[PDB]
Structure formats: structure tokens, C-alpha cells
From a paper:
The RDases can be split into two classes: (i) the canonical respiratory dehalogenases, which use a halogenated compound as a final electron acceptor during organohalide respiration and (ii) the catabolic respiratory dehalogenases that occur in the catabolic pathways of non-organohalide respiring bacteria.
Only one conformation provides a halogen beta axial ligand and thus resembles the 35-DB-4-OH substrate complex (occupancy 30%). One of the two distinct, non-Co-ligating conformations corresponds to that of the previously observed 35-DB-4-OH in crystallo reduction product (occupancy 30%), while the other occupies the entrance of the active site cavity (occupancy 40%). In the latter case, the 3-B-4-OH benzoic acid group forms a salt bridge with K307 (3.1 Å) while the phenolic oxygen interacts with Y426 (2.5 Å). Indeed, inhibition of [name] reductase activity due to inhibitory substrate binding modes likely accounts for the higher Km and lower kcat seen for this substrate in comparison to 35-DB-4-OH. The lower propensity of 3-B-4-OH to bind in a productive orientation might in part explain the lower activity seen with this substrate in comparison to 35-DB-4-OH.
Numbering used by the authors: -2 to 697
Write the structure that this text describes.
């Protein structure tokens, strides 16, 4: 695979994006002319996704405008900084291309707010579609504009809400609900030119759709593209992406892989029938959802401060607040548990192997980074819900598991526990829930029960589904599985369904031996919650059990950031998507003799250091509905020194298997103070995986 960037973007600020837009011919003004956005080249049937992406577009539309917070005294004045931060925000949310332009009278003369002076214009590129005759082509053909419009409305809604929380009135616009001329503003903002009355954007050869945020929050404006002639898209500096931008050949190369195979070469990873760590199904107890340690925090199980902060701790930052409406209001759409009657829509559904390819292709078309399929085994479902305490049924046969990359470049400039951490969680959560909600809907359209499991509402535990779907291995981080290509830098989304699909197999890329020689995540955890010792048996399976009490307490309670994810950032597998980055992963997998060296040089080269160029976000904590400067400061952590050579023997963590959890049926209205002394003793008594294998063998 030769599409990886040759050159690093480590010195490229995020407001510049992944495309070398700063190398295109531009001029101060251009004469406006009629233009429409690109459209599909075919129509969509009743077999098609179309109805579902339109529903979610309509849902996001109700968050294009909303309440405006009081103006604090911490919002930077400089329009240039405002421009970069908002541009970077849009790229964070996966805009393909971003620009800014000034609104003039003719725009404010419509239903648009008359106090609006500037427009943030962004484009999202059409998704890749299955080739004719491929599995799922009928589900997708003709849905690209609506599909891309949904994504635009999403981003517009988040960004508009983001500015509104900084105290500035703002309004999102897209084809489905726009008060301004979208095409006209895209040309003025320098994203596109006009060919035969249709917009044409450089680099976005697949087509695109637009979104816009109009606001009185003043921004530095960009300049339109040179109206005629070659823009320089194929100049040598741009073709090779010398500044760390998308190579000029990557599109043509990527488009040679079948869409259902995803972008990362998972087909090259070794497969095994059973996971690389022991799983003893007959010994795995199901856990009350009330045993979720956030649910425990919420009920008072972890003290009053954890209970107080449980609601706000991930919403301290205005960007995450812009995502909350979408997150919470997608929940009522997650799907059904009852059996459905196959409706005859969706084409030929008799080949489970073709069904899996269509589902994977469908996920990648919608924005997933990884798709895997496994059976939703009953021990993967929670025993009981946390609100009413009623039993949860194992109501679906299959689990579709998708990984959303949390974002390398943002995490590179962060501490892992500063004011953007929860925003990296919530973005991946918001994006996965959207994609999974759309896919479950389509399954239900075809007459196959399906329900998604999101951050706001899940009835399965994602982890074992990530394992069985072959998307990660057990890693030292504990409650996080590690993928060979994006390491631990992910949020998973799962949706269960009865749609017959061929399942994937667990993967084996050598991580057990690698984590056995590595301690970086454990060394860098601010509250020492990650284990330095051997794997233990836990509720019937082998795992590195982190101390989930200490982690929960720190994420909900620490006041120099919003939550934490520092362990993802520090892991050596958290790497840039470069030629040398992939090769370091390749070597880690194929050359065991080189692992110790890679683990050491990761420190010697100061990997994990904060890259100040990538720190694009504002430090804003919302207190009493008003964004202000962080009341207590901001985490700015740097590489830490070794703990003892004896820390694996001395560190003592608490574990909470079902025995030390709220029993099935317990609700949030009961309180069960965390029995830490019992969790410490429990951990000391945990069977070692070696003893479990001996014990199982004696009944084989
Ligand atoms: C609440 C919660 C936490 C809590 C508490 C978890 C807990 N154990 O109580 C803390 C602990 C606060 C937490 C921490 C983080 N977690 Co969290 N956690 C959750 C959440 C929402 C609940 C887990 C749960 O069901 N209850 C707790 C009970 C079931 O815990 P348990 O009995 O000890 O079992 C745990 C593990 O043993 C594992 N597991 C259970 N059965 C089996 C069986 C096998 C064979 C294996 C291998 C594993 C496994 O799953 C449980 C995860 O907590 C899930 C989301 C979800 N719906 O699953 C994620 C989730 C697992 N965590 C996730 C992440 C990303 C994080 C963080 C990195 C935060 C961040 N910035 O992203 C940190 C890392 C923590 C670490 N050191 O590993 C991701 C992991 C994805 C992945 N790639 O593996 C999840 C899946 C959310 C998601 N949608 O992606 N979060
Ligand atoms: O319930 C919450 O507040 C919550 C749930 C999931 C999650 O990843 C985070 Br961060 C917070
Ligand atoms: S284990 Fe928890 S507290 Fe420690 S670095 Fe990871 S997210 Fe932060
Ligand atoms: S930091 Fe090292 S030990 Fe921790 S998960 Fe990553 S590779 Fe494994
Ligand atoms: Na790293």
C-alpha cells in the first residue's frame, strides 16, 4: 500500500487542513454568477438509504439555531485567531474544505439575522460508492447528496452551537434549511469556482455539498479562487504533499480498493478463530448496567463530588456543548428490539457473505474508519437496565462494530486531560451514533430488527464485540482495545441486528508480547489507574484490569481539563499516518525482535510530547452557563520519568467483577458505596491466566 503520506504534518497548524489550499491561485474578488451544488448522477430507489439520511438531516436541522449564552470575558478579540480556531474546529469535525467570507447586504436581506457579518463556509465531499454489481450498491446509489447533506447539517449545527455558547448569535445553513445563498458564499469564501452553472471545488473530484455558519462573531476572511485557468492543484509541492498534505495520487490509489475493505489494510492482519487472550464464556457473568462506573458515580457510589460533577464533566467546553443536542436527541432513533418481518426491500439478501460486504461498504460510505461483524453473544448484553432495573434480552443475533478515529493531530497538541479531551470523545461518539443510527434504520427498512448502542444509551458492552469482530486486541490500557493501525485512538459504535451476515474472526498482530514489554500508558496515567503487572482473570476472561474507580474519579472530577484520555495519546501505537509511521507498526507486528527497541525509542524520541503547533482550541470552561477562563488552570503534561523497577509488584489496584458490583436489577435510586478495600483484596486473589488454563485443561 503506497497511498500513505510521505511527509509529516507535525509543523502544519490545523486551520490549514489536510489539503494544500494555501497553494492555490487566488484573487481579492470575483464576480458572482449563478451556481448550484453538485448532485447525484442517478436516482435512489426504495431499496435505498435515502429515507434514513434525510431523517437525520431533519433532526440536525433543529439545532442550526438555538439559545445564545451570556458573553464572558475570555473570547479572543483577534479575528485572525477566531478564523483559525473556527476553521480548525470544522476540520476536526471532518470538513473537507473550509473558508470564510464577509456577508453583504444582499445576504442579510433574506430571513437571515441582520446582525450577521461573516460566513464560515465548508464543503464535505461525496462519499465513495460501491461499484456497480458490488454488494450494497443499490442501498447507496443516488443517496450521496442527501448523505453528504446530513453530514453538513451535523457540522453546521455543532459549529453554530459552539459560537452561540461563546456568546455570539450564530445560525447554521445547508441545502435542507438555508437562509443564505450557499453556492454564492462558497465561491466568495474561495472553496469553488463555477463550471456550466455547477460548483467545482479543487481536490474534491467526487462532488460535494455545502454547509455554512453565519454569525456576527467577526472573522478574518479568505480570498476567492482565481476565476479562470489552472489553480495549481497538481504543482509538484502539492502532488507530493511536501507540507504533510494529502498526496495527489491518494484518491486514485484508494479508489482501487473495494469500498467494503475500508481504508486500512485489515486483510493483511493475521486472523485466528479464538482471541489472543483467554475467554471462558461459561464463566462470564452478565453485569447490571447500573454497574457502569459512570452510572455508579451518578448514583453516589463514588462520593458526592463525583456525583455532583457526573453531569457536567464532559460538557465544560463550548465545542462539546455544541454536540450535546445532537447526541441526546439521536437516542430516540436508535432502533427496535422486537423481531421484524423481512419486507422484501434491499435487493438480494440471501448471501450472508454479500450482506457483510454491503454493511461494511455502507459504514465506510457513511464515515466509519473500521467495520467488523461478530455474533452478539448473550454475555455481551447487560443483565439489566439502570433506570427501572428490568432484565435486558439478548434480542439480536449480530453486532456490527465500527471504530471512529478520535484524531491524531488534535491529540498531539493536547495533554490528554486538558479542555479538548471530552470534545475528542464526544465528536467520535456523535459521529458513530449518527452512522450507526442510519445503518440500523436501513436494516429495519429491509425488515430486519436493528438497534444502535451509543454513548447515551447502550445495552451491550462494546469491548467483547470489538474483540470478537477482530478490530483490536486486549491492551494494557485495560478497558480499551488496541487496533494495529490507529492504536487505541478510537471510539466504538455498535448496532445489533438480525440481518444475516458472515462474521469476522479475532485478529493477532502480536500485541500481547508487545504490551508485555511496554509501560508507557501506565507510566503516564495521571492517577496511576493502569496496571504495571501481569494480566489477571476477571469475570471469566483474561485482561489487564485497570483501576476503574481511580480513572472514573479523575475523569469526572479533575478540574484542569474536561475528562481525560491521556493513555490513548501516550501509546506508541498512537502514530501519524505517514510512510514511516506505518512501517514502525509493520515492524512491531512482523519483527518481534524489534519491539523492545521501538518501545524504548518511542521515549528517546520524545513521542507523546505536546506539539504546540497543533493546539488549535480555546481554553474555555463553562461555569453557570457562561464560558470563562479555566477556573483552576490547564493540564499541560509532559513525558514522565520511570516508576520503580519494582512497581509491578508494589502497585495495588482495585477490581470490581460482578461480585463487587450492584447486582442485576439495581437502579440509580439505590446507592452502593464502592467497596475499595474489597476491590483491593479481590485483585490480590484473581486467578492468573496460567492457572486458569491449567484448570480448564483438567476438564477438557
Ligand atoms: C463507563 C465507562 C468508562 C469508565 C468506567 C468503566 C467501567 N469498567 O466501569 C472509565 C473506567 C471511567 C472509562 C475509561 C475509559 N474508557 Co470507557 N467505558 C465506559 C462504558 C461507557 C461503560 C462500560 C460498562 O459497560 N460498564 C462497566 C463494566 C462492564 O466493566 P467491567 O465488568 O470491568 O468490564 C470492562 C472491561 O473488562 C471490558 N469487558 C467486559 N467484558 C469483556 C470480555 C472480554 C473478552 C474483554 C476482552 C473485555 C471485556 O468492558 C468493560 C469496559 O469498562 C463503555 C462504553 C460501553 N458501552 O461499553 C466504555 C468504553 C469501553 N471505554 C472506552 C474509552 C475510549 C475509554 C477511555 C480511553 C476514555 C477516552 N478518553 O476515550 C478511558 C480509558 C480507560 C482505560 N484505562 O482503559 C471505549 C473503548 C473503545 C475501545 N477502543 O476499546 C468504550 C468502549 C466506549 C466506546 N464507545 O468506545 N470509561
Ligand atoms: O454519562 C456520561 O456523562 C458519559 C458517558 C460516556 C462517556 O464516554 C463520557 Br466522557 C461521559
Ligand atoms: S486510565 Fe483514565 S485517568 Fe488514566 S490516562 Fe487513561 S483516561 Fe486518563
Ligand atoms: S502504551 Fe505500551 S503497554 Fe500501554 S497499551 Fe500502548 S503498547 Fe500497550
Ligand atoms: Na506516540
Amino acid at each position: 500500500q503506497i497511498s500513505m503520506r510521505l511527509y509529516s504534518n507535525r509543523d502544519r497548524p490545523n486551520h490549514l487542513g489536510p489539503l494544500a489550499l494555501e497553494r492555490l491561485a487566488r484573487v481579492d474578488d470575483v464576480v458572482a454568477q449563478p451556481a448550484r451544488q453538485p448532485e447525484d448522477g442517478f436516482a435512489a430507489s426504495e431499496d435505498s438509504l435515502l429515507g434514513d439520511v434525510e431523517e437525520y438531516a431533519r433532526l440536525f436541522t433543529r439545532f442550526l439555531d438555538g439559545p445564545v449564552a451570556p458573553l464572558g470575558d475570555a473570547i479572543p478579540d483577534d479575528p485572525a485567531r477566531r478564523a483559525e480556531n473556527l476553521k480548525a474546529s470544522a476540520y476536526f469535525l471532518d470538513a473537507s474544505m473550509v473558508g470564510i467570507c464577509r456577508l453583504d447586504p444582499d445576504d442579510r436581506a433574506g430571513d437571515c439575522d441582520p446582525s450577521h457579518t461573516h460566513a464560515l463556509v465548508f464543503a464535505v465531499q461525496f462519499g465513495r460508492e460501491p461499484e456497480a454489481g458490488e454488494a450494497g450498491a443499490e442501498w447507496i446509489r443516488g443517496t450521496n447528496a442527501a448523505r453528504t447533506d446530513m453530514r453538513c447539517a451535523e457540522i453546521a449545527a455543532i459549529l453554530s452551537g459552539y459560537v452561540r455558547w461563546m456568546g455570539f448569535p450564530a445560525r447554521g445553513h445547508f441545502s435542507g434549511d438555508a437562509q443564505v445563498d450557499l453556492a454564492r458564499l462558497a465561491v466568495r469564501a474561495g472553496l469553488a469556482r463555477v463550471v456550466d452553472g455547477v460548483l467545482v471545488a479543487p481536490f474534491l473530484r467526487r462532488g460535494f455539498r455545502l454547509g455554512v455558519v453565519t454569525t456576527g462573531y467577526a472573522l478574518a476572511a479568505d480570498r476567492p479562487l482565481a476565476p479562470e485557468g489552472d489553480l495549481g492543484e497538481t504543482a509538484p509541492e502539492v502532488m507530493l504533499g511536501i507540507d504533510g498534505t494529502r498526496p495527489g495520487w491518494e484518491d486514485a490509489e484508494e479508489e482501487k480498493r473495494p469500498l467494503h475493505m475500508g481504508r486500512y489494510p485489515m486483510e493483511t492482519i493475521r486472523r485466528v478463530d479464538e482471541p489472543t487472550t483467554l475467554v471462558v464464556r461459561q464463566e462470564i457473568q452478565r453485569v447490571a448496567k447500573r454497574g457502569d462506573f459512570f452510572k455508579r458515580a451518578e448514583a453516589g457510589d463514588l462520593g458526592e463530588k463525583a456525583k455532583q460533577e457526573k453531569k457536567r464533566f464532559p460538557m465544560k467546553h463550548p465545542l462539546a456543548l455544541g454536540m450535546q443536542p445532537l447526541i441526546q436527541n439521536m437516542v430516540p432513533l436508535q432502533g427496535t428490539r422486537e423481531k421484524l418481518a423481512p419486507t422484501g426491500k434491499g435487493g438480494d439478501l440471501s448471501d450472508p457473505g454479500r450482506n457483510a460486504e454491503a454493511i461494511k461498504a455502507l459504514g465506510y460510505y457513511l464515515g466509519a474508519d473500521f467495520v467488523g461483524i461478530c455474533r452478539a453473544e448473550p454475555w455481551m448484553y447487560y443483565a439489566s437496565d439502570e433506570v427501572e432495573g428490568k432484565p435486558i434480552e439478548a434480542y439480536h443475533d449480530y453486532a456490527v462494530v465500527m471504530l471512529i478515529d478520535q484524531g491524531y493531530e488534535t491529540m498531539e497538541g493536547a495533554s490528554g486531560d486538558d479542555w479538548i479531551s471530552a470534545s475528542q470523545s464526544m465528536r467520535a461518539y456523535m459521529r458513530g451514533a449518527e452512522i450507526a443510527g442510519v445503518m440500523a434504520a436501513h436494516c429495519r427498512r429491509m425488515g430486519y430488527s436493528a438497534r444502535s448502542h451509543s454513548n447515551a444509551h447502550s445495552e451491550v458492552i462494546h469491548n467483547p464485540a470489538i474483540l470478537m469482530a477482530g478490530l483490536g486486541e486486549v491492551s494494557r490500557i485495560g478497558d480499551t482495545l488496541l487496533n494495529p493501525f490507529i492504536g487505541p485512538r478510537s471510539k466504538s459504535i455498535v448496532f445489533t441486528t438480525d440481518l444475516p451476515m458472515s462474521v469476522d474472526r479475532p485478529i493477532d498482530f502480536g500485541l500481547q508480547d508487545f504490551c508485555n514489554q511496554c509501560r508507557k500508558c501506565a507510566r503516564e496515567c495521571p492517577c496511576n489507574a493502569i496496571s504495571f503487572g501481569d494480566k489477571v482473570m476477571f469475570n471469566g476472561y483474561e485482561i489487564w484490569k485497570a483501576d476503574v474507580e481511580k480513572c472514573t474519579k479523575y475523569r469526572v472530577t479533575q478540574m484542569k481539563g474536561s475528562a481525560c484520555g491521556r493513555c490513548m495519546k501516550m501509546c506508541p501505537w498512537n502514530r501519524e499516518d505517514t510512510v514511516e509511521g506505518r512501517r514502525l507498526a509493520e515492524l512491531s507486528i512482523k519483527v518481534p525482535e524489534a519491539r523492545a527497541a521501538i518501545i524504548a525509542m518511542d521515549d528517546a524520541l520524545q513521542n507523546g510530547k505536546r506539539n504546540l503547533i497543533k493546539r488549535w482550541w480555546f481554553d474555555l470552561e463553562v461555569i453557570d452557563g457562561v464560558a470563562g477562563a479555566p477556573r483552576m488552570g490547564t493540564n499541560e503534561r509532559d513525558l514522565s520519568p520511570d516508576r520503580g523497577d519494582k512497581i509491578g509488584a508494589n502497585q495495588k489496584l482495585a477490581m470490581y467483577p460482578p461480585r463487587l458490583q450492584p447486582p442485576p436489577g439495581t437502579t440509580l435510586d439505590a446507592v452502593l458505596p464502592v467497596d475499595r478495600s474489597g476491590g483491593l483484596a479481590e485483585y490480590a486473589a484473581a486467578e492468573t491466566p496460567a492457572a486458569a488454563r491449567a484448570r480448564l485443561k483438567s476438564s477438557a
